[PDB]
Amino acid sequence: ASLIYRQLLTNSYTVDLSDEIQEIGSLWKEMQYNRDITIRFKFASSIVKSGGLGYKWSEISFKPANYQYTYTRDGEEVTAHTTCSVNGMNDFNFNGGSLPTDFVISRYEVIKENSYVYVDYWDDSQAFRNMVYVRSLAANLNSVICTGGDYSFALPVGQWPVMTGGAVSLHSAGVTLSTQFTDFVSLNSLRFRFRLTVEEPSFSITRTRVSRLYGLPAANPNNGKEYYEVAGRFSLISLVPSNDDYQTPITNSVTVRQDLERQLGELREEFNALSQEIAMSQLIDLALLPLDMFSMFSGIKSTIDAAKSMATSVMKKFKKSGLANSVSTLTDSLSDAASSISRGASIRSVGSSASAWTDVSTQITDVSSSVSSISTQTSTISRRLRLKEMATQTEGMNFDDISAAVLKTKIDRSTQISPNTLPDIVTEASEKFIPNRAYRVINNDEVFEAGTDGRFFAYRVETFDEIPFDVQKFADLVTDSPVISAIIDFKTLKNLNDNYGISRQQAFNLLRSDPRVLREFINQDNPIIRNRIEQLIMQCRL
Amino acid sequence: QNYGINLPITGSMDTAYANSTQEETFLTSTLCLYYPTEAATEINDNSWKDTLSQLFLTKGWPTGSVYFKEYTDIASFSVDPQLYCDYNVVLMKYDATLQLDMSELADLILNEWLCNPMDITLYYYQQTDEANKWISMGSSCTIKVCPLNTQTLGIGCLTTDTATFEEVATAEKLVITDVVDGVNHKLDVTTATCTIRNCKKLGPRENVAVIQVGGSDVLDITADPTTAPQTERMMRINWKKWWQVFYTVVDYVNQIIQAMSKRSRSLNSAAFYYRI
Amino acid sequence: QNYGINLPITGSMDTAYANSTQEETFLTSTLCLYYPTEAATEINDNSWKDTLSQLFLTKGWPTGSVYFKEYTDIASFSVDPQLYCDYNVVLMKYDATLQLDMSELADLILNEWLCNPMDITLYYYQQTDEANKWISMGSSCTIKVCPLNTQTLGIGCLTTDTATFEEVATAEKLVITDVVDGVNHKLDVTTATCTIRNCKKLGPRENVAVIQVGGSDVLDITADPTTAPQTERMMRINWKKWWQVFYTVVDYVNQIIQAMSKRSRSLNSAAFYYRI
Amino acid sequence: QNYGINLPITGSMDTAYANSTQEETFLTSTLCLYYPTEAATEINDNSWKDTLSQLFLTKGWPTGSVYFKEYTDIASFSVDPQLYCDYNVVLMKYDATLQLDMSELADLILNEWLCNPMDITLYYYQQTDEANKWISMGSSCTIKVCPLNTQTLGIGCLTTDTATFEEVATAEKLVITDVVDGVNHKLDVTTATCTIRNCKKLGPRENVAVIQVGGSDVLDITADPTTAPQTERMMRINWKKWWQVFYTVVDYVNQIIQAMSKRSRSLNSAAFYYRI
Amino acid sequence: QNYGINLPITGSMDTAYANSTQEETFLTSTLCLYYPTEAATEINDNSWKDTLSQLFLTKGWPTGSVYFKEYTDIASFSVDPQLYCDYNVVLMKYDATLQLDMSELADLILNEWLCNPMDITLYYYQQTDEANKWISMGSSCTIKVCPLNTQTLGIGCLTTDTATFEEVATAEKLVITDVVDGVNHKLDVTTATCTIRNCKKLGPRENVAVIQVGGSDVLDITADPTTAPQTERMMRINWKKWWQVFYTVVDYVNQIIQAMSKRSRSLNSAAFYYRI
Ligand SMILES: *[C@@H]1O[C@H](CO)[C@@H](O)[C@H](O)[C@H]1NC(C)=O
Ligand SMILES: *[C@@H]1O[C@H](CO)[C@@H](O)[C@H](O)[C@H]1NC(C)=O
Ligand SMILES: *[C@@H]1O[C@H](CO)[C@@H](O)[C@H](O)[C@H]1NC(C)=O
Ligand SMILES: *[C@@H]1O[C@H](CO)[C@@H](O)[C@H](O)[C@H]1NC(C)=O
Ligand SMILES: [Ca+2]
Ligand SMILES: [Ca+2]
Ligand SMILES: [Ca+2]
Ligand SMILES: [Ca+2]
Ligand SMILES: [Ca+2]
Ligand SMILES: [Ca+2]
Ligand SMILES: [Ca+2]
Ligand SMILES: [Ca+2]
Ligand SMILES: [Ca+2]
Ligand SMILES: [Ca+2]
Ligand SMILES: [Ca+2]
Ligand SMILES: [Ca+2]
Ligand SMILES: [Ca+2]
Ligand SMILES: [Ca+2]
Ligand SMILES: [Ca+2]
Ligand SMILES: [Ca+2]
């Protein structure tokens, strides 16, 4: 289950890829609204003429156009407002010559297959005031044909050129949420995308060497039509805040905690309270799942926007936390130690040979309690054995597995979810879950053990009796050999052996944190292992 | 109590019976008689309440325990009826034209209800279980309901045009609406004249007995069409004069209250618990 | 499930699993704020209720859980107050001229009262024990009392002459009368504009808190002179602006709720004791 | 000392008491008596300071230890009060109209505070903890608050239009503002007339005692509505003349100092510790 | 945790040196630069503060963590200067005519002074030990002193006539008076124009450093003639351009801060010793 953390870090690069496009871009009840809509829209034309005698036009281009109308839907006269715009246009040009006399078109816009037509749509119906929290949204529409019409050019001399022809089919491709800016309020609207397909009518300009040109110029794209109409259906699923099964809001304009809080302050208490209802054996079963990104983030009942960015938002927050910086510092220290036989003096070794895993550092030191040097050394080492946990250099199930299992079983139960809450609750959970955790390394039927709390223990596997802890041997063992998380750490092991005489195989498995022995002991309702796992779960307190 | 509510109570099938407690029950309780105005009009006496109190005392009630509440008619009494005493006896005059209303009144006062406010202008409303109803009372309540579908569109009604809604109650002092469960309904009611609440029937009341004066067995205190239970608390008598009715009530107060039970009078006098 | 009986509950003094979730209160329970009209006047914002709901929602209360109720003044609010939310907070402004009234108001809402009807025309009334009071409410309650003797004749008064009655309340919107126990009294009350009820103080009303906005501690919710308890539900805050008062209420709403408990009379556990 | 602050101190429960240190404390400390100007006016004497110093000398304070500081009134004294010597006794005259102000002054000088500057013109501000408040003082304060949402838009107040902001103070010489924690607030303050700081309550101030001259217990030195502590350093006395008040202070100086503790004096006399 | 108690510290000599804390202190501490107005005049740039902030950021200080305070001249800066940053550096221009004043300023900001009030009108004053001085500050101080013999009679002066007193200051904006210890002096000071305080020198002030721009080593921060200690917090630089001075300060900010230490008095460990 710890794999999720690793994967987030591993995938953190994609987060950057998101930000780029983003900065290029700019309980609950499900209620359904399938509505048969009729989008009536149109284009506008900007015809800016150049100086001189009027033979030259500086620009003849598209311009967004607004439209209002009323139509019948299930016997309801519904007033609708739409705004049509275009994107990705081809800037053709005509250059009759350098003289002021010759027909010149500096830049005229034609929409082709590489363009897109965007249409905001709104109405005063119920469906369009329930779409603040949206689960799913999908619209189908019959394609429409937009043909270009005639447009004569105002030359006072000679034949009048005419812009005839031109046609494109708009086919529905995608619908999203959008906003209409009024004078004093802001309206939620449905913005439909339409892909263009060139059609047989080819637009040409008379008095010119222009023919068999395809697209839809901006000159007279309406072709005299009052509007362009597409009839279809849009399906919307809205998440309405409801705390009882008999009520259902007509409108969902309700405020949620994240509309007012950006730093979750009291949701920490919600999580700490949720911790009570956690089962033990089933938690182990969940912790043994290789929880990947899909498994972790598939079961959350999100909104339309939240699901679209859950993984990358979580990862954006993830590649900043103390865990990510600790991983980065460990990697840099290892690379520096490997990169130069120059500063073995700067680093001081608590082992036979120098290693980044076995270096002593700042440790401002705590005179509050009489502290042995060995305790400080072991604590400093264990704080990096945590990065060993998150570097696939462990053997048994690790504390990170338990942390991930608790995180999953809590986020699914927690009713507090939002595009900003899941970030900083996954990351801060990984940071603050099980802060005091111990590790052990086995060698020649002897177990060495260290803890971030500063407690160290050396003992024998066959019989759990403590041994003079041999620093400079625990360090050499721990730099290379597999490191085992101490789920059933020495004290619990000795208590269990004294009270519940365990077999050689059971002790073997418990030492290496084998899941099977753990779950079998839990199923027997053994108070000691249950107590230890309860302490571990309550340590996952965020 | 509350911490021991979900605990067993064990009793041997040989424990000796205790002496009669009706005397102490009368000495420690209060009795309320609800009668129409026409009863007092026909009696045509001012001291009749005092005489009834004295007769009840002859039947074992301390002077001060019997109270008499007068209501105009069944319809008016149905607007937020109040049950004051430990024991409530309601003398409902039978009118063949108000059967449903009578039933409704009985259904309200013979049963415990748990009710919530209904902002019909802001929410659609479902009835989740057969025990869920919509109790509306006021000066004049007119309820119009539009059943929606899974797509929040009215069925047989235009969700915006109230004129197409379905009339389930018109100018009602009290009405207990029961719609199909699991269906969201859009409601429009004369909110200025009446209040509508989403209520749950919790069970019987056990301290309100309805005596129907004249008529036949017409009360139906259960919305289920295939049940018309006649509990011990709903009695029926025949009458030609009201003094005989009151003498019958006094002389058989022992039997009337033997069908009722204390421990059910709420702290509030209202006919339903309310949760806003 | 066992509702009519008080069964003992046993617990272990060394029991583990002291879990908690105050969030259960926020999402399941509703909050009601009762404030005077002058507070809204001074605030002078047409959306201040929305802002306060937002701020409460910062504290975990989902929108729609918090309700705001307006009352003109202490005297008007005292006429049959109806507090229905799960948690009730009453911002009562201090008026040095209206001490007793405030006390009475608090005594009515901070305690639980079991009230029976009073027919002053028919019956003479005693107060059996220390918890027995006579609570009268209405637009103008004027209560005059004539104590009797064992021969039923008045003491310092004539039963047939109300002019000699000893006035104890004059034009009161709410008044709690305490007279000598074990003495019959003839009561003259303005029944047209006032209803008087014979009430027993069962105990504290856990889910009602009163925040006194102003002067010093003056409330006396106990008729006994020797004791003037100040329970945790009787808060007191100094003020100059009402926005400050409401901000203090919202910021410390958790402590205000902590000082309160669910109404012991309003849950299924108390079923068939008095109410639900 | 500082390196050993986080070390245990072990003491036997049988160690002999040391002799009284009251005499040594008086011989090695300084006392400040803050009184209103009306006290000096009513006493109407030019040598009363000398008489009080001599009377304190009779009580053990060497000449030169007692100091007398005069303030015009609570409002003027509340503008950055200065506490000069080891023991500060503030005689605060009670006016029923300024209760909150008195409380604020007490809450300023009876507690340690850690304040930081607030650039209300540049940034929005939050109150992180219940111990966090906004203390503003000067010639005249007028604080308008606008809570914002996650999108920085105001709530019940347009960000640009200060006229829509919520007023919490007006022409205040001192005010402690407490807004809902975790919500960003845009502040409009009369920075020209008064300064606002983001302050944190560290704990009690042992070297400052406040004697309330007349009135009742009205001081509230905690913003929490549920708590209104009356610490040993908050005295209250009744008065008809100021000479009696001063004689009472002198005679019971031992008790007053007993309610206070040494080592709480700072180099600076300010009412807070300023970090910038 | 254990405040007000001096516990011994028993560290060992073999524990390894910790990593550099310079970066963390720069990240978590604030720096104040005090310079004369002529500096900003000569620099003649409206954004020089921003450039210096950016350069300090190149040296590791977060943007906005460096404050630039301006003072007119030494005399104006000696009017109770308030140094509130974690690290304070005072760029003091040298003037041969203002040597003593310069020293006085240093003696007030490079040391720690526990000051108690002085009522010259009421009490006579003596300086108990060599660490006790009389610091007077304000618009203009003119201190005249009359030593008194054991007969409380002036020595070379008349207690009644202040013209016979001895002048120790004249029109001073700050002066540290050191008189013979153990002698009671009658003081005549322009109290209306400036204030005097009895101050004990506790020890060095570690967060304040003084950089003398131009001149020679003239500061004498000790009243003792036999000692003229140039501490590590007193720097001296020769200058021609103020831009050069500021570039020197920012370039060697590491060395300047190294010479300084966190104010021992202003921090949590000093709680109930003098502050925080
Ligand atoms: C209380 O919490 C503990 C751990 O926090 C958990 O084991 C227990 O099941 C919870 N609830 C009960 C009722 O014991
Ligand atoms: C109950 O009734 C019996 C017979 O009527 C009588 O003798 C007895 O005293 C009564 N009381 C008790 C407590 O048995
Ligand atoms: C304390 O007081 C006692 C008795 O009053 C006296 O004998 C002793 O000298 C005093 N001082 C000490 C340090 O015990
Ligand atoms: C520790 O000291 C080294 C040696 O100079 C230095 O490079 C490093 O930045 C210091 N700090 C940390 C956190 O390693
Ligand atoms: Ca009816
Ligand atoms: Ca219809
Ligand atoms: Ca139904
Ligand atoms: Ca039926
Ligand atoms: Ca009389
Ligand atoms: Ca009253
Ligand atoms: Ca009584
Ligand atoms: Ca009392
Ligand atoms: Ca004030
Ligand atoms: Ca406003
Ligand atoms: Ca606050
Ligand atoms: Ca308080
Ligand atoms: Ca000087
Ligand atoms: Ca002289
Ligand atoms: Ca001296
Ligand atoms: Ca010297």
Q: Which of B193, B223, B219, B203 is nearest to B127 (CA)?
A: B223
A300 C-beta neighbours (distance < 10 Å), count:
15
Residues having C-beta closer than 5 Å to ion ligand 18 = E 156-157, 164
Ligand nearest to the Cα of B18, by number: 2
Report residue A446 CA to chain centroid gap. 46
A497-500: long-range contacts at Cβ-Cβ below 8 A with a sequence spacing of 24 or more? A497/A464, A499/A528, A500/A526, A500/A528
- Nearest C-alpha to atom 14 of ligand 4 is from which residue? E19
First-last CA distance in chain B: 25
CB contact under 8 A, E123 and D274: no
Helices and strands per DSSP (H, E), number in chain B:
7, 12
Look at C122 and B6 and tell me if their CB atoms are within 8 Å. Answer: no
CA distance linking residue E276 with residue E264, whole number of Å:
10
Rounded to the nearest 5°, which phi and psi values hold at E85? -70, 160
Which of C23, C27, C59 has the CB atom closest to A243's CB atom? C27
Partner residue opposite B123 with nearest CB, options A32, A33, A247: A247
> Inter-chain contact D273–E266, Cβ cutoff 8 Å?
yes
Distance between CA atoms of residues A368 and D5, nearest Å: 9
Nearest residue to A38 (alpha-carbon basis) of A65, A73, A77, A67: A73
State the angle between helix axes of B48-58 and B242-251 in degrees (0 to 180), rounded to the nearest 10.
30
Residues 6 or more apart from C63 whose CB is under 8 A from it? A241, A254, A255, C53, C54, C57
- CA D35 – CA A347 distance, rounded (Å): 65
Rounded-to-integer distance, Cα A260 and Cα D149, Å:
5
The secondary element (H helix, E strand) that includes residue A362 is none
User: Is residue C37 within 8 Å of residue C71, measured between CB atoms?
Assistant: yes
- What phi, psi does C49 have (nearest 5°)? -60, -40
Residue A58 near residue A71, CB atoms below 8 Å: no
Dist CA D78 CA B251 (whole Å): 79
Distance from CA of C59 to the nearest CA of D (A): 9
Ligand 1 lining (C-beta closer than 6 Å) = A 275-276, 534, 538; C 17, 19
The structure tokens listed for C69 are 């109720």
> CB D266 to CB E272 under 8 A?
no
* CB-count burial class (<10 Å; 0-12, 13-18, 19+) for E268: middle
Q: Tell me A503's DSSP state.
A: -
- At residue B193, the 3 state secondary structure works out as coil
Binding-face residues of A in 234-293 toward D, CB within 8 A? 258-263, 265
Q: Is there a binding annotation on residue B107?
A: no
User: Exposed e or buried b for every residue in D199-214, given b needs 16+ CB within 10 A?
Assistant: bbbbebbbbbbbbbbe
Task: Give the whole-angstrom CA distance, residue C111 versus residue E212.
Answer: 75
How far apart are the C-alpha atoms of C229 and C203, rounded to whole Å? 13
Cβ(E186)–Cβ(E165) below 8 Å: yes
Assigned token pair, C84: 């229905």
Q: Least CB-CB distance to E269: which of D5, D84, D264? A: D5
Angle separating helix axes A399-413 and A281-288, nearest 10 degrees: 110
Q: Do B123 and A31 touch (CB under 8 A)?
A: no
- How does strand C87-93 pair with strand C208-213? parallel
C122 and C133 Cβ atoms separated by less than 8 Å:
no
Contact assignment for B273 to C275 by CB distance below 8 Å:
yes
Integer distance in angstroms from the first to the last C-alpha of chain E?
12
CA dist D254 to D23, D87, D109, E21, E147, Å?
10, 12, 21, 49, 34
Place of tokens 């009356």: D230
Question: DSSP secondary structure string, A227-238?
Answer: -EEEEEEEEEEE
Q: Which residues in chain A have Cβ-Cβ distances shorter than 8 Å to E18?
A: 362-365
Select from A48, E96, A331, D157 the least CA-distant residue to C48.
D157
CB C232 within 8 A of CB D226: yes
Per-residue DSSP letter, E269: G
Residue pair A158/A180 in contact by the 8 Å Cβ criterion: no
Q: Which residues of C touch D149 (CB under 8 A)?
A: 54
Task: Provide the Cα torsion A14, A17, A18, A23; round to 10°.
Answer: 160
B32, amino acid identity: C
Touch between chain C and chain E: 3 or more Cβ pairs under 8 Å: no
d(CA A245, CA C29): 15
Neighbours of B64 (CB within 10 A): 19
Residues 6+ apart with CB under 8 A from E185: E124, E125, E126, E145, E146, E147, E148, E179
**C42 — contact with chain D (CB < 8 Å)?**
no
Q: Which of A329, A350, A362, A366 to mutate to test the interface with E (most CBs of E within 10 A)?
A: A362
Ligand closest to E133 (CA) is 19
- Cα angle A329, A330, A335; round to 5: 95
Question: This structure's resolution (angstroms)?
Answer: 2.9
Alpha helices in chain E (DSSP H): 22-28, 37-43, 48-58, 74-77, 99-109, 242-251, 253-259
Using the 8-state DSSP alphabet, how is residue D19 labeled? P
Segment (H or E) for E94: none
Does A70 contact chain B (CB < 8 Å)?
no
Measured between beta carbons, which residues in chain C are less than 8 angstroms from residue B276?
Answer: 30, 32, 67, 84-85
Alpha carbon distance A463, D127 (integer Å): 57
What would the DSSP string read from start to end of E186-249?
Answer: EEE--TTTEEEEEEEEEEE-TTEEEEEESS-S-----S-TT-----TTEEEE--S-HHHHHHHH
Q: Which residues contact E203 (CB under 8 A, 6 or more apart)?
A: E111, E112
Task: With residue A210 as reference, give the H or E element that holds it.
Answer: strand A210-213
Following DSSP, what letter does each residue of A48-108 receive, concatenated?
A: EE-STTS-EEEEEEEE-EEEEEEEEETTEEEEEEEEEEEES-EEEEEE--SSSSS-EEEEE
* Cα A400 from chain centroid (whole Å): 21
Q: What gap in Å lies between CA C54 and CA C104, rounded to an integer?
A: 34
Q: Give the residue from chain C lying closest to B204, CA to CA.
A: C272
> Which of B120, B115, B243 lies closest to B184 in space, CA to CA?
B120
- Using CB atoms, which residue from D6, D150, D181 is nearest to A259? D150
**Is any Cβ of chain D less than 8 angstroms from the Cβ of E34?**
no
Nearest to A453 by CA among A441, A467, A430, A436: A436
Query: Is residue B95 annotated as involved in ligand binding?
Result: no
Please report the sign of the dihedral spanned by the C-alpha atoms of residue B19, residue B21, residue B22, residue B26.
Answer: positive
Contact between D210 and D234 (Cβ < 8 Å) = yes
Using CA atoms of B187, B191, B195, B196 in order, give the dihedral in degrees to the nearest 10: 0
Helix axes A399-413, A527-539, angle to 10 degrees: 70
Ligand 4 pocket residue status of A98, Cβ below 6 Å: no
Q: What is the DSSP letter of E148?
A: E
CA A134 to chain centre: 17
A163, containing H or E segment: strand A163-164
Spatial CB neighbours of E187, under 8 Å, sequence gap ≥ 6:
E118, E120, E124, E125, E134, E143, E144, E145, E146, E196
Q: Is D243 exposed, middle or buried (0-12, 13-18, 19+ CB in 10 A)?
A: middle
Residue A346 CB–ligand 4 contact under 6 Å: yes
Binding residues of C for Ca(2+): 45, 127, 156, 164, 166, 178-179, 181, 251
Place of tokens 């807070």: D272
**All chains having 3 or more CB pairs closer than 8 angstroms to chain C:** A, B, D
CB contact under 8 A, A261 and D183: yes
Is residue E275 classed exposed, middle or buried when 0-12, 13-18 and 19+ CB atoms within 10 A define those classes? buried
Q: For residue A72, what are the β-bridge partners? A: A77
**Selected residue of E2, E7, E15 to mutate for chain A interface (largest A Cβ count, 10 A):** E15
Chain breaks in chain A (C to N over 2.5 A) after: 26
Residue type, B262: K
Buried b / exposed e along A409-440 (16+ C-beta atoms within 10 A): bbbeebebbbbbbbbbbbbbbbbbbbeebbbb
DSSP string for residues in C217-237 = ------S-TT-----TTEEEE
C-beta of residue D267 within 8 angstroms of C-beta of residue E265: yes
**Cross-chain CB nearest to A32 (options B122, B151, B160):** B151
Could you give the strand order of the β-sheet that contains A228-241, starting from the edge strand earlier in sequence? A28-41, A228-241, A134-141
- How far is Cα C255 from Cα A54, in angstroms, rounded to an integer? 79
Burial (CB count within 10 angstroms: exposed 0-12, middle 13-18, buried 19+), residue E192: exposed
Q: Do C63 and A270 touch (CB under 8 A)?
A: no
- Give the SS3 label for residue C204: strand
DSSP per residue, B242-269: HHHHHHHHHHTHHHHHHTS-SS---SS-
**C165 exposed, middle or buried (CB, 10 Å; 0-12, 13-18, 19+)?**
buried
Q: How far apart are CA B95 and CA A184, in angstroms?
A: 59
Closest listed residue to residue B83, CA positions, set C80, C275, C265: C275
CA-wise closest residue to B91 among B266, B262, B244: B244
* Å from CA of D70 to ligand 11 middle: 54
Q: Which of A325, A348, A361 to mutate to test the pocket of ligand 4 (most atoms within 8 A of CB)?
A: A361
Return the closest-CA partner of residue B210 out of B33, B25, B26.
B33
Q: Which ligand is nearest to the CA of E198?
A: 19
List the subunits that have 3+ CB pairs under 8 angstroms with B: A, C
Give the H or E element holding residue D202.
Answer: strand D194-204
Count other Cβ atoms within 10 Å, centred on residue A182: 9
Q: Which of A188, A191, A193 is nearest to A131 (CA)?
A: A188
- Which atom of ligand 1 is nearest to A275's Cα? 5
Give the residue, by CA position, lying nearest to ligand 1 atom 10: A276
CA angle D51, D56, D57 (to 5 degrees): 95
Closest to E193 measured CA to CA, from E234, E244, E139, E135: E139
d(CA C21, CA C27): 11
Q: What backbone torsions phi and psi does residue A316 show, to the nearest 5 degrees?
A: -60, -45
Q: Which residues contact A74 (CB under 8 A, 6 or more apart)?
A: A36, B153, B158
> What letter would DSSP give residue C15?
-
> Per the CB < 8 Å rule, is E11 touching A367?
yes
Neighbours of chain E (3+ CB pairs under 8 A): A, D
Contact D156 C251 (CB under 8 A): no
How far is it, in rounded angstroms, from Cα D230 to Cα D211?
Answer: 12
DSSP code, position E154: B
Collapsed DSSP state (helix, strand, coil) of residue A375: helix
